[PDB]
């Protein structure tokens, strides 16, 4: 339904943010504004019907926010690239 508080896959990221684009600041998902790029923020998109878009054991929020093992490469922090040895 028409609002920005739907979490169909229940991974703490609203559907609209996942469809259009979002980023993590202070461990909260926010809308992506193009001015964030010059500050070094990366724009993420992910499946809004799957809690693990890439199939790895870490959810989209865990990967995007970096709330996982610090030894994992920063490339695997966006949901479309799998953390995979």
């Amino acid at each position: 339904w028409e609002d920005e508080d739907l979490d169909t896959d229940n991974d703490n990221i609203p559907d609209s943010y996942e469809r259009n684009g979002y980023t993590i600041k202070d461990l909260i998902a926010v809308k992506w504004e193009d001015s964030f790029a010059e500050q070094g923020y990366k724009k993420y998109v992910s499946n809004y019907l799957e809690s693990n878009t890439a199939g790895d054991p870490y959810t989209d929020y865990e990967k995007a926010s970096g709330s996982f093992d610090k030894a994992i490469k920063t490339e695997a922090r966006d949901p479309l690239v799998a953390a995979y040895p």
Binding site: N10, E50, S51, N52, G55, P57, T59
Partner: protein
């Protein structure tokens, strides 16, 4: 190890037999050295491009080698071979958590194998270089409280193999798998059921027979096939064809005064394998017979008498050369048949 199902198996632990002449030398269950962690459908452990694994221990901790007797050694060096049979395979499935946390430990397939086999029918599609095996649930008429949906053989095949319907006929990927374009192989029980249901049936087609439990259906795609409509797989060309009418099973006659000739160069056939040449022959009115000649290893002659409708003859031959001249099949006999 190889998989032809629809689901992966984790921790593949098969048990195998070793047979020399009529003796089972040993039955070894795979230890940690011979367990495959992942086996996806259509894949193979070890993966393609890797050497086969070694199975040379029989005890639980992989510390004892597999011995044989003096007589068995004499049999082995006399030229006799050891055969391998698989009796059972142990493995795990993965249950997905709401957060996507896959867990496979404690999830055995053996807890579901018997129950699945009891209420399902096995359908096998045997194409070139790749095979598929499926289980489709069937309804039990003796029990009024069984509410599983009814399916015919055609619908069962379409759902099991992901077939596509173009004009009422099934295609797997781009190969016709309709009952008239393949070879249907049943066991005795399924053959009896099919025959006893076709006589009751009205349209008289195998694919319209209701699917029943315990049925064993094997479908084999042809190596070469022609319908004279849109599909031609033969490498060579028929001597004389006729496709100017809407006849046959689908819009094709291929019959005139002359007789049809084909010469398979034998470079595109198996070296030592046994084949079958099938087809459908019809005559609108009672007429003479058909002289079918096959020449692969020894020239075999058989006489064909068609009928008002269409029937299959499936004349059978043998190739054991891999180097000889072409393969000659002819269907001498005229009289405006189909």
């Amino acid at each position: 190890y190889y998989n032809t199902g629809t689901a992966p198996m984790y921790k593949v632990t098969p048990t195998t037999n070793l047979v020399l002449d009529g003796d089972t030398l040993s039955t070894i269950k795979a230890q940690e050295n011979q367990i495959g962690n992942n086996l996806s459908p259509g894949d193979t452990y070890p993966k393609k491009g890797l050497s086969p694994l070694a199975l040379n221990t029989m005890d639980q901790f992989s510390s004892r080698l597999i011995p044989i007797n003096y007589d068995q050694l004499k049999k082995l060096d006399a030229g006799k071979q050891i055969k391998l049979e698989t009796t059972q395979v142990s493995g795990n499935f993965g249950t997905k958590n709401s957060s996507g946390q896959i867990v496979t430990e404690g999830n055995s397939w053996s807890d579901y194998i018997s129950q699945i086999d009891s209420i399902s029918a096995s359908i096998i599609l045997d194409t070139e270089n790749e095979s598929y095996e499926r289980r489709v649930t069937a309804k039990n008429l003796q029990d009024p409280e069984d509410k599983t949906p009814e399916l015919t053989i055609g619908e069962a095949i379409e759902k099991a193999f992901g077939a596509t319907k173009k004009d009422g006929l099934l295609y797997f990927n781009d190969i016709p798998i309709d009952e008239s374009c393949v070879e249907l192989i049943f066991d005795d029980n399924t053959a009896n059921k099919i025959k006893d249901s076709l006589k009751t049936l009205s349209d008289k087609k195998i694919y319209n027979v209701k699917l029943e439990r315990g049925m064993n259906i094997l479908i084999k795609t042809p190596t070469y096939f022609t319908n004279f409509d849109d599909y031609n797989n033969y490498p060579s060309t028929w001597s004389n064809v006729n496709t100017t009418n809407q006849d046959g099973l689908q819009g094709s006659a291929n019959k005139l005064n002359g007789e049809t000739k084909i010469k398979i160069p034998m470079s595109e056939l198996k070296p030592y394998k046994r084949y079958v040449f099938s087809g459908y022959s019809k005559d609108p009115l009672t007429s003479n017979s058909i002289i079918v000649k096959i020449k692969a290893k020894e020239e075999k002659t058989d006489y064909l008498v068609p009928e008002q409708g269409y029937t299959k003859f499936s004349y059978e031959f043998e190739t054991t050369e891999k180097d000889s001249s072409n393969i000659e099949i002819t269907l001498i006999g005229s009289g405006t048949t189909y």
